[PDB]
């Protein structure tokens, strides 16, 4: 006698990008295998995958780069079907990213030593691509909200680039007023925008940096990796709107030409985002639509401010519950706010 | 249990190889990044160059 086969998730439909809008049951799974294009700048002569040569001796007083010389993050979007059909007051039914899987495409393209590299010594081969790497990707239901950081505030950027505003010495430290969104492929330069670690309740990003003058780049390729994107509460990146946002950027190191010019190099990136269906509280009830009905039509009023730094609302006493009459009308809360401490 | 289905990626797609090497035919600009035009099948010893 043998043994009755074991059970396995009965695979269903398969095909191109237009598979998605076919409706499924309630406990569906989905697997999405997709990639991205790295944006290294792409100079001329169809060398799509390098950058232009780097500047050598720009002083701090005046910097003049070009659009080509700065790599940028890569982002895209995945449309999704909606799931609710009738009203169904109460609860809704959204998507969820659960398990990512990344893998770099073209990693053995660096073994070319018959290229236009520098002759490394007199009768040997050439010099391979070495130096600083920075690999980075992100999966979420929302655009990747990011923090503005740079050095040398006197840099005047080219006007195709989305760069932070009013450069001071405060921009060389963690500043609060350089917030923005990520809504455009090939526009945000990588030397000016780290991910904001504060604001991301619906975006998980992974990144390992290694600078240095000339260090080896170490790459893996394995189809047994698995990175769980669940949090410590039991959710993944939820999809508020019908989308799923993918953002990444891959730097591989510097290439040396045969005469001495340095120029960058990158590769693409794989993704396998397993999705599924969850049950949440409705964030769009009829009461939200009603307020957005009236607030479209009602007249704009532009008066003196009532929110922000130059505000004029002073003290708001939000109190409901009752209590035994206090023996002080103005009770104080902090014990010593400013400090009258020792020594 | 099946031959190793691979992916064609290369740089400097204007390089001309000898006849023994099975290279990606019709080399385009897309081959230096993720391209879809270069599926293949591993079936032949000493044939597919690893770069």
């Amino acid at each position, epitope marked *: 006698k043998p043994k009755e086969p074991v059970q396995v998730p009965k695979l269903l439909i398969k095909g191109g990008v237009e598979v998605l809008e076919v409706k499924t049951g309630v406990d569906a799974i989905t697997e999405v295998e997709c990639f991205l*294009n790295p944006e290294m700048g*792409d*100079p*001329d002569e*169809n060398l*799509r995958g390098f950058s232009l040569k780097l500047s050598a001796e720009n002083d701090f007083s005046s910097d003049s780069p070009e*659009r080509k010389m700065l790599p940028c993050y890569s982002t895209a979007r995945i449309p999704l079907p909606n799931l609710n059909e009738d009203l169904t007051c109460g609860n809704l039914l959204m998507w969820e990213a659960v398990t990512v899987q990344t893998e770099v495409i073209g990693i053995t393209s660096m073994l070319n030593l018959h290229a236009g590299s520098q002759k490394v010594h007199e009768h040997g081969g050439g010099k391979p691509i070495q130096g600083s790497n920075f690999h980075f990707f992100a999966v979420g239901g929302d655009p990747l909200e990011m923090q503005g950081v740079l050095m040398n505030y006197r840099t005047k950027y*080219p*006007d*195709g680039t989305i760069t932070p505003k009013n450069p001071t010495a405060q921009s060389q430290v963690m500043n609060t007023d350089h917030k923005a969104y990520l809504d*455009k492929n090939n526009a945000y330069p990588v030397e000016c925008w780290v991910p904001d670690p504060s604001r991301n309740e619906n975006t998980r990003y992974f990144g390992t940096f290694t600078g240095g003058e000339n260090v080896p780049p170490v790459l893996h390729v394995t189809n047994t990796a698995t990175t769980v994107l669940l949090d410590e509460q039991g959710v993944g990146p939820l999809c508020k709107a019908d989308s799923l946002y993918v953002s990444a950027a891959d730097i591989c190191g510097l290439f040396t030409n045969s005469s001495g010019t340095q120029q960058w190099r990158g590769l693409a990136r794989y993704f396998k985002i397993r999705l599924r269906k969850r049950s949440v509280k409705n964030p769009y009830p009829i009461s939200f639509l009603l307020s957005d009905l009236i607030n479209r039509r009602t007249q704009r009023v532009d008066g003196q401010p009532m929110y922000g730094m130059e505000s004029q609302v002073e003290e708001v006493r939000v109190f409901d519950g009752t209590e035994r009459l206090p023996g002080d009308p103005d009770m104080i809360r902090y014990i010593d706010k400013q400090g009258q401490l020792q020594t | 249990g099946d031959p190793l289905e691979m992916q064609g990626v290369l740089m400097n797609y204007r390089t001309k190889y000898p006849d023994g090497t099975i290279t990606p035919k*019709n*080399p*385009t*600009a*897309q*081959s230096q*990044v993720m*391209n*879809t*035009d270069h599926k293949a099948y591993l079936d032949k010893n000493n044939a597919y160059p690893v770069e």
Partner: antibody
Amino acid sequence: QVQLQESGPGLVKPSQTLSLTCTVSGGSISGGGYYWSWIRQHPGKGLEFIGYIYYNRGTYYNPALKSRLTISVDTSKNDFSLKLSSVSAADTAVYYCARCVLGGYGSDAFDRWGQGTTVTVSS
Amino acid sequence: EIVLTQSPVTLSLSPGERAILSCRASQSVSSHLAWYQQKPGQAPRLLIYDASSRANGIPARFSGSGSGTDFTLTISSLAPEDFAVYYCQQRSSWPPSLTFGGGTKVEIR
């Protein structure tokens, strides 16, 4: 280094079928992120888009010309084609053919298109 | 569809001045813009791709600026080999349109 050319008729009678060849030499017509477009420019007006082709069954036409077109590709002579149906006297215009790139520049701009040819239709 | 309304009609401009064109769109596409230079009796040729990126071979006296709807073909100084016919073009992502505009021809006084 890619060289292009054009060829075809020089005079088309009313209510006939027009055919043109956008000759390509020095590159694959099966080229990955490449389209292959047509641009007409009528004497006295600007230019107008007609149609591009993707060699894994991607077509798109200008909806003003109402899907009266077929664009065919023959891989041997490295060249593609174009078909008009039921031409009129208004079609007398110099005709250009060019290429679109998806990952690089993003348009018909890389100094890469046909050198031009003229079509005359009258009585 | 999408229509690129272009204005002015025919600028009467002397050599050496600052020229500005404006290809204001019916709706925002904001990144898939081009600028085609064509002389009469010649073939088309690019000025600016992606609305700000200069072309290799075009010297830096031209530039591109602006995105959203109100676009700008910035010209620092006009050349006697530049008094010709200038166009604009809108691309398309989801739906295939990418038609073209109307044109503005620079008159030489």
